[PDB]
């Protein structure tokens, strides 16, 4: 299953306007898929441990999660994706803290690539753009399993 803490990350990424009272009840309807990644290929695995990509699906919207390194710390990034692969919705972090989540929201995706220029000297901004593009690529690749 998904713990309530993780549901809050997923629903935030997806822009699911909800009350905390309903979070666990609504969250039972989230579909979750875990993937290894080997040279661009995402294979289903049974649980989140060792996962390189986690894809959530709820009320016709996607969110992807991936491990990320943010100023030297191991963390996870979540990002919501519209099911036409044209926009991201919201991003958030577990395990680190960055103002960049205010940048990486409501952006266009053009053929699997975010429409944004980042400061090339900011390791965290490069990491966010790299991670979000990696996630969009993965979610598009496995989408035939969901809403194609
Ligand atoms: Zn968290």
Give the torsion through C-alpha atoms of 68, 145, 61, 137, to 10 deg: 40
Technique behind the model:
X-ray
143 burial (CB, 10 Å; 0-12 / 13-18 / 19+) is middle
3-class SS letters over 21-78: HHHHHHHCCCEEEEEEEECCEEEEECCCCCCCEEEEEECCEEEEEEEEEECCEEEEEE
What domain range includes position 103? Answer: 4-145
**Span from the CA of 28 to the centroid of ligand 1 (angstroms):** 18
Measured in Å, residue 94 CA sits from the centre of ligand 1 at 4
**Based on the structure, what is the number of domains in the chain?**
1
Nominal resolution (angstroms): 1.5
In sequence order, what are the residues at sequence separation of 6 or more whose Cβ sits closer than 8 angstroms to the Cβ of residue 10?
A: 2, 16, 27, 30, 56, 58, 63, 65, 78
Phi, psi dihedrals of residue 15, rounded to the nearest 5°: 70, 30
Q: What is the dihedral of CA 16, 54, 138, 74, to 10 degrees?
A: 100
Residues, beta carbon < 5 Å, ion ligand 1: 94
Token reading at 89: 């919705």
């Amino acid at each position: 299953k998904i713990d309530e803490h993780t549901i809050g990350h997923v629903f935030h990424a997806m822009g699911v306007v909800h009350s905390k009272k309903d979070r666990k009840s609504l969250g039972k309807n989230i579909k979750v898929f875990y993937f290894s990644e080997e040279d661009g290929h995402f294979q289903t695995i049974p649980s989140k441990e060792n996962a390189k990509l986690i894809v959530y699906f709820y009320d016709n919207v996607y969110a992807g999660e991936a491990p990320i390194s943010i100023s030297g710390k191991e963390a996870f990034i979540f990002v919501g994706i519209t099911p036409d692969f044209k926009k991201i919705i919201n991003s958030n972090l577990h395990g680190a803290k960055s103002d960049l989540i205010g940048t990486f929201k409501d952006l266009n995706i053009k053929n699997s690539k975010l429409e944004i220029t980042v400061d090339e000297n900011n390791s965290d901004a490069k990491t966010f753009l790299e991670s979000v593009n990696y996630i969009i690529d993965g979610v598009e690749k496995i989408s035939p399993m969901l809403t194609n």
